[PDB]
Amino acid sequence: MDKVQYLTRSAIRRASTIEMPQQARQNLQNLFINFCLILIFLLLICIIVMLL
């Protein structure tokens, strides 16, 4: 790596934050529900496997 490091930095930062600063902020919300889903369900799936 040597050029793909700065080329990528400007590929998303100067494209996904200047053209969709209002949408990207709202879309990022999906990261919260996804983690919370996998974070709370990873425990429930164990209740049935540890009993049946």
CATH of the domain at 37: 1.20.5.290
| 10: containing domain | 1-52
Report how many domains make up the chain. Answer: 1
CA distance 5 to 17: 18
CA distance 14 to 21: 10
CA distance 41 to 49: 13
Question: Quick one: CA torsion of 39, 17, 20, 34, rounded to 10 degrees?
Answer: 0
CA distance 45 to 51: 11
Which pairs count as long-range contacts for 2-7, CB under 8 Å and 24+ apart, including other chains? none
